[PDB]
Amino acid sequence: MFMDMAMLVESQGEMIDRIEYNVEHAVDYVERAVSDTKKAVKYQS
Amino acid sequence: TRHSEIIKLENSIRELHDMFMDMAMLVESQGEMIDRIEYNVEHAVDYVERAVSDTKKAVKYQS
Amino acid sequence: DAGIRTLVMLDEQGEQLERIEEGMDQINKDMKEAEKNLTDLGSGGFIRRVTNDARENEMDENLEQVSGIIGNLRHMALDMGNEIDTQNRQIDRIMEKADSNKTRIDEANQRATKMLG
Amino acid sequence: GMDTSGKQAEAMALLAEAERKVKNSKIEEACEIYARAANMFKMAKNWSAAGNAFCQAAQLHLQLQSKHDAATCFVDAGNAFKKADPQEAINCLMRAIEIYTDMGRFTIAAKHHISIAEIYETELVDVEKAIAHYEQSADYYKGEESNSSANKCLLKVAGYAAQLEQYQKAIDIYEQVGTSAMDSPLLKYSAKDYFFKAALCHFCIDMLNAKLAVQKYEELFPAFSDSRECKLMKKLLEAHEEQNVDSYTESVKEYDSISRLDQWLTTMLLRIKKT
Amino acid sequence: GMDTSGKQAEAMALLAEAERKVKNSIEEACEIYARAANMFKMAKNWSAAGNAFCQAAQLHLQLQSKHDAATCFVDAGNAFKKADPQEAINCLMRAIEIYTDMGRFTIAAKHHISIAEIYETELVDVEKAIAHYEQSADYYKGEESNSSANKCLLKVAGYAAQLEQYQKAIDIYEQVGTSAMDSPLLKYSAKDYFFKAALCHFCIDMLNAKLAVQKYEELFPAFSDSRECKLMKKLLEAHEEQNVDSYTESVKEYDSISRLDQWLTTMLLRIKKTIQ
Amino acid sequence: GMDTSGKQAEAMALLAEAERKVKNSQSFFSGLFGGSSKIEEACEIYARAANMFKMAKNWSAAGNAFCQAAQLHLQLQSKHDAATCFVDAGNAFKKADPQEAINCLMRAIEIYTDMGRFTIAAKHHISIAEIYETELVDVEKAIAHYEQSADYYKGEESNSSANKCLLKVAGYAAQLEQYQKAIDIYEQVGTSAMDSPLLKYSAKDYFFKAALCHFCIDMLNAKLAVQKYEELFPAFSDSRECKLMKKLLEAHEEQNVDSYTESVKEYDSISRLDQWLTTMLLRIKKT
């Protein structure tokens, strides 16, 4: 039964890593878009 | 002394078994939930990227 | 060994979950600020000794050893337990945030297309 | 205590100034300031007044052009009233559930259904009413393919029905869940337990057919033979064939020496044995 | 109750409104179709909800949208899952096509797994299930998700041994066992897989099984200390003398110590029948 | 089957069309100044062709198309998409030819670290170290990459991940007959993990390794070492490792190789030994 539990734990872990990678990409793009909007607003104004 | 020790061992085994019941069920539920959230976030990021790209193209067309 | 490996892996998963929660909170804060700015733009024995003999010793000894190990497992089990419970709550708490965030962006984009015409 | 009086005074002042501001475009500011007043009242811990103000703010937000905020405020008001008049909380949570279903989010609707069923069963004595909400939540979860939640709800309703003396529904749900668990590669170890429960319920009808039922469970699931539950059931049935009280008492004591029996099992066991 | 009639009438009204809106000729029509389909689903009218969902998906795809189109196609497929199994396969195939074209191969693998499961559970077909499982395993292996590929390959090998020539089972079992032997956590189960492979060699001839078990013992020393090796050696020795009694005695003893999966039972019955 | 030939032919035709498009793009820009629409469209064709080659099991063509798209989009001043395409090419290379993947991943790491995104750089460094480990036995480069990744992870305050990298580094260093670094890393990790609730149960194991890695230097400094641990972590005395170490020390103190060997056989029989432990015990036995 312990042997049964192990693989479930491993799979959940790898899925967590993948979701983390996606989150990093999303936050990076959001910050870059914020910077671009700041540039546009400040210079146009 | 026999009955005490043997029943104690059996009780320990049963305790472990019950714990594993409850928490295997819990982990299965958690796995389902994580499965949902992964797709949720993927769709969210894709849609925000698409919309912001539309914004860039429109604003550059107007200016 | 399987028990110990599961414990360490669970710890790592919990740390990763906390990291992603922080990331989601940052995403929400930054997106809200950006949207607002853009809007502003406008035990004695175990076996009977029926025949004594060396065979009766090791057997008993073996049983004794077994008992010891089982005890340890109990604690391990219960300890590991607590972890997953917390994780459960944490996971749910991210979803809502993300969902809310997603909803906002859609309406924001919709607004960005309705003000134009 | 000073803290309660101070926080109550601060929350009352904020709510009064919010009312004055709204009385003086304006809808959004009024909704936001009322939300802040409700938050301060919540920190003031006056549950009834805080919930009343929060639901009033929820209605005012309904007056504003938005749906998600309306549903969030409704669920928060229901939580606030959780420790107050249950009827108002039930109404608000039902409205929130209706909105969520209108939006196509069946999972959150099922969650809220389970929550309202919990508050109904724990607070009041009317049990049959919670059965309807539990069944609706099970239907929603099954439609969404979340088998775990559906199984949990079905188990709860089956136990309550067995308590209510409707053995047929309990036996049907228990058999279905047990066979589903046996089919699944995981959770199989738990399957045995379900089978045992069914037998007990089926005993309340008669004793002779219990032998056929247990033999059917045996042939359907051979491993059930090695489970102590099967031995206990067969021993109890054999002993009951003769009207001797010592045999089944001794058997249940021997089983209890290993694990303590739960309230539900104990009450049904007393019911069967006493007659 | 009021639910059935009321929701059915409202869904028909919304469908008629969307039809009129398209007759005027557009996103409002798609939203109306989606709401009507949602209310149909709420009404328990499982059938004809997927029809409205497919209509909405086609209308949305007409304007180059592909993500929401795929999501709604999958929604319609799962809705038809229980009411009409056949149409769900086609809808899921369309969704898989779109997703694989756009490159989200994990989603395609998941949909392939779902297709194989529905094919094997409700309908009766093994070759299609094997093909779908193999395709999903190939996708996952290309995406280097080892565990899922191992699971799919194990299922494929199990079914192939169930009906197909045992060569596929030998190959898959040997590969999986060899890969798992080095892994720290998974090594303890490796024995099992090896044992299975050896049994599949028995179905052909005894000499092949003997050579294979010798090779496995050479490769994996621990296999010598396994009870499986002793059981196999005893069974082969009994079979070499054409004595069914020893075969039965050994099989019964091993079964007494440990219960059988009902797979090993089938293989043992086949081997015993051919002892002659 | 039909898939091979059909996919190859269609992908080749699409790639040739993309080549013609990029050739005509310069003329279009010179004659009308169309901008970057042509270039972006050509990049889209290249990405689609790379994906189709990936589905067609032709890894090399997918890698080449990914590299072409990455280069073209980098020429368009878009470093992020160039890095993404280069990562895909590196995976295809690691999936087609690894040597090219090494430089592709190095370029992606440089681009990412230019902006201060340390976590992705550390992950890519771990991937490069794994690539080196799987095929080649050039341990030194793997150690360098693991050290760099562990340094980045420590600088990101992400604990419990740098620990694994340092454990790998120490385990590989102990193989090259350099024991000081292994002892230091093992003792540091053990003392760090002693206080953790969940990790506590594993702590003991680490100590044992150090002791073995401490036994080769000289027997005298091993005995004492054990004492230093036992007083600090009394529960260590309960584990089988302490008894095994004491028995091995007693057997070796009198050149009794047979008793040492018999105890090793018994311990292996109860639980199978690892290749690392087997090799180290053989090395110790040589004395």
Numbering used by the authors:
A (entry chain H): 215 to 259
B (entry chain G): 197 to 259
C (entry chain I): 41 to 82, 130 to 204
D (entry chain L): 0 to 23, 36 to 286
E (entry chain K): 0 to 24, 38 to 288
F (entry chain J): 0 to 286
What does the study report here?
The membrane-anchored SNARE (soluble N-ethylmaleimide-sensitive factor acceptor protein receptor) proteins provide the energy to drive membrane fusion in various cellular contexts, such as intracellular trafficking and exocytosis. Supercomplexes of NSF, α-SNAP, and either a syntaxin tetramer or one of two binary complexes of syntaxin—SNAP-25 reveal atomic details of SNARE processing and show how sequential ATP hydrolysis drives disassembly. NSF comprises three structured domains connected by flexible linkers—the adapter N-domain followed by the D1 and D2 AAA+ domains.
To gain insight into the structural nature of binary complex formation and disassembly by NSF, we prepared a complex of NSF, ɑ-SNAP, and the binary t-SNARE complex (21bin20S) composed of full-length soluble SNAP-25 and soluble syntaxin-1a (1–267) in the absence of divalent cation (i.e., non-hydrolyzing conditions) and performed single-particle cryo-EM. Classes with evidence of NSF D1 domains engaging ordered ɑ-SNAP—SNARE sub-complexes were carried forward; eight 21bin20S models were built into reconstructions ranging from 3.39–4.01 Å in resolution, differing mainly in the orientation of N domains and a sub-complex of three ɑ-SNAP molecules and four SNARE motifs relative to the D1 ATPase ring. As such, the stoichiometry of the syntaxin—SNAP-25 complex observed is 2:1, the dominant species in solution. Three ɑ-SNAP molecules bind the 2:1 binary SNARE complex; a flexible linker between SNAP-25 SN1 and SN2 blocks access by a fourth. Docking the 2:1 binary complex structure back into the seven individual 21bin20S reconstructions reveals an apparent preference for syntaxin, with six of eight reconstructions featuring the N-terminus of syntaxin H3 bound within the pore of the D1 ring.
